[PDB]
Amino acid sequence: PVLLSLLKTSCEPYTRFIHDWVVFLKHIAHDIYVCGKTINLLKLC
């Protein structure tokens, strides 16, 4: 629990960044990089 309650709040600001465009398996790594730039591009249009 103690580590979880830290991780549950140590990722709070990072979700916000992810909440804009809207090791680990690289099958999704490069996809996140483009899944955001599209949102950041529609914001200027």
Next chain:
Amino acid sequence: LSKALQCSLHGDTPHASNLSLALKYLPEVPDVLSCLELRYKVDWPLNIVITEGCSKYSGVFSFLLQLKLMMWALKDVCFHLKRTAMAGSVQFRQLQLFKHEMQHFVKVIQGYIANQILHVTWCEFRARLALEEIQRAHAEYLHAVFRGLLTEKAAPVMNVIHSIFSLVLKFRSQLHPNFALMQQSYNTFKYYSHFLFKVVTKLVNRQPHLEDFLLRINFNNY
């Protein structure tokens, strides 16, 4: 250009603008070269897809314009000779057969271009589309420059084309005071054309795009 678009009978839309007919060189002074570009222009939400390098249209354009210089100059001598007509002799008829023999070679190399760079390469990239893919699909459509004999790999095939285009321009200069001076020119034309058929054949063993060329240049001959 603003006088050209009026005679287009297709265009005069917001798309039709942004045709900056600019240049990229200052010519000093019979050849087959007249360097001149023609660049499209776009705005923000489309500029991010159509790359400012996909500059390669200007590469394939200066060739296609250079081709028109033949079918007009050659049309001139076909029209320049018409007013000469009473004057019927061996020197006359034997002269006009050269034009029909030189024109057909241009009207077949053009028919090739009008099949690869405008119709089959357009069949793809039209039934291919229907965000990252749009960049690569477009980078694969134009990469029109391969079937266009502009690639450095098949460059020797292109170098020989100038020898053909040059001799037709000289044929236009001599619009029968100097018949023999022209008879030697045509004989140089029949040699170079006969050399092209061998250099393309030798380059088959080493490109399915070039395969259709030999079927175009050769038909009931050797």
